[PDB]
């Protein structure tokens, strides 16, 4: 789910960049170091609002190392999945152990043990799919799934979905 959050970043600048263009350079450095990153605490930062008018304040010189430390506060759009949430998805891969879907930047893996039994995996089909009499879910097929668990990594998030309840599966 997408949100607006007020975040802050600590930026350290080498003395070789102490020029008139210091502020703009700090802005592009912030944009390059925040746009697209993935933090387990917050999720995924997709964009920074008002990216060219961010206040940086006054940097403090670190005693003994010369480099200046800047405290940058900004508002950004953040997306983070939650346990027990039902969202739309697009299937990216089909495999005997289960199928992998994509919910924005997040890639969700659904095991066969969380798939209804009638959706038997068909490897002979082109492309291979988990199909039933009235349902056929393959690569590129819209699916509505509920996120059950989320795994936190260093700079990545792994989520597990399920389609075993009602109003789920193919859409």
């Amino acid at each position: 789910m997408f949100f607006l959050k007020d975040l802050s970043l600590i930026l350290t600048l080498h003395p070789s960049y102490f020029g008139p263009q210091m502020n703009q350079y700090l802005r592009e450095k912030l944009l390059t170091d925040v746009e697209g990153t993935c933090t387990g605490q917050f999720g995924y930062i997709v964009t920074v609002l008002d990216g060219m008018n961010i206040d940086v304040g006054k940097g403090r010189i670190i005693p003994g190392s010369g480099s200046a430390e800047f405290e940058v506060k900004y508002r950004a759009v953040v997306w983070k999945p939650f346990k027990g949430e039902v969202v739309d998805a697009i299937v990216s891969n089909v495999s005997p152990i289960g199928f992998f879907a994509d919910v924005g930047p997040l890639n969700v893996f659904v095991s066969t043990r969380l798939i209804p039994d009638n959706l038997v995996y068909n490897p002979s089909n082109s492309p291979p799919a988990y199909m039933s009499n009235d349902e056929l879910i393959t690569k590129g097929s819209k699916v509505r799934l509920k996120v059950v668990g989320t795994r936190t990594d260093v700079n990545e998030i792994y989520a597990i979905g399920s389609i075993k309840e009602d109003f789920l599966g193919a859409i």
Partner: protein, 285 residues
């Protein structure tokens, strides 16, 4: 090994008709795959008549062994290779051995029999679906393309054609509730709407199918006495109560898209395009 191969196969023991169909499909698959080998054998050994007929007989016998008698490949190759080679005598009556098959061909036999056992369930499902449709008149296109159906792609084409041209009937049979939106609901509305007669008047479906199958003109597409815009606007004005369209241009676009869907779901166009691409297509990156 056979148990591992057949673990996913719930229904294995086919009927005699299905067994013969499997043998024919396997023979055709090998002939398509080993066309170069068969051609070289026929060209080099042109003196012997119907070498490929003996090849088909040997393939049928090998399939019989593997399926009915459950014989592993090395046992067949070490104790039944007499069937796999045809000993003919030349004009000098010298005994010449002709290695019709190799062990790799027996592995191909196993893979092909597994493939046909897989597609047999799909073809039975399509047959059951058609029987549930229970058409008053048997669709000639259905029979013509089902008789020549070999690949699962053609079975999928049959399914798409049947579902498109009987969307209301298929939906009723499903009914005979999760609010999944039928992608053919708009086309069903067009069928129910007063503009569907115009879609008929564009061209006769049966005449179109006959002309396409013949590949030459059997009937001439008769142009209606009034223009598409004229007829659409006239019917909209005279049936404002039932014409769900807002503007005549919207009805025109709906008729065009319905005709496009009708043409797209025609199995013959898809089959011809697939054959052309498989024969003369190129690869670009």
């Amino acid at each position: 090994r056979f148990q591992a191969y057949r673990k996913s196969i719930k229904n294995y023991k086919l009927s005699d008709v299905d067994y013969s169909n499997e043998r024919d499909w396997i023979v055709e698959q090998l002939k398509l795959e080993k066309r170069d080998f068969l051609q070289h054998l026929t060209q080099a050994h042109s003196s012997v008549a119907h070498l490929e007929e003996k090849f088909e007989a040997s393939v049928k016998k090998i399939v019989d062994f593997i399926a009915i008698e459950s014989f592993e490949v090395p046992f067949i190759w070490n104790h039944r290779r007499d069937y796999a080679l045809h000993t003919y005598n030349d004009d000098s009556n010298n005994t010449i051995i002709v290695k019709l098959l190799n062990e790799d061909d027996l592995w191909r036999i196993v893979q092909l029999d597994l493939d046909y056992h897989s597609i047999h369930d799909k073809k039975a499902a399509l047959s059951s679906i058609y029987k549930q449709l229970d058409l008053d008149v048997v669709d000639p296109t259905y029979e013509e393309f089902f008789g020549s159906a070999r690949t699962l792609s053609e079975l999928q084409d049959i399914d798409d054609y049947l579902t498109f041209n009987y969307s209301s009937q298929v939906k009723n049979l499903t009914a005979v509730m999760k609010r999944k939106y039928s992608k053919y609901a708009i086309y069903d509305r067009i069928r129910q709407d007063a503009i569907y007669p115009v879609v008929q008047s564009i061209a006769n479906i049966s005449q179109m199918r006959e002309n396409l199958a013949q590949s030459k003109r059997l009937h001439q597409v008769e142009d209606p006495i009034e223009s598409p815009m004229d007829m659409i606007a006239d019917i909209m004005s005279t049936e404002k109560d039932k014409t769900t369209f807002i503007s005549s241009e919207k009805a025109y676009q709906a008729v065009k898209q319905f005709f496009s869907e009708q043409l797209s779901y025609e199995p013959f166009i898809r089959k011809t395009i697939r054959t052309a691409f498989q024969s003369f297509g190129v690869i670009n990156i």
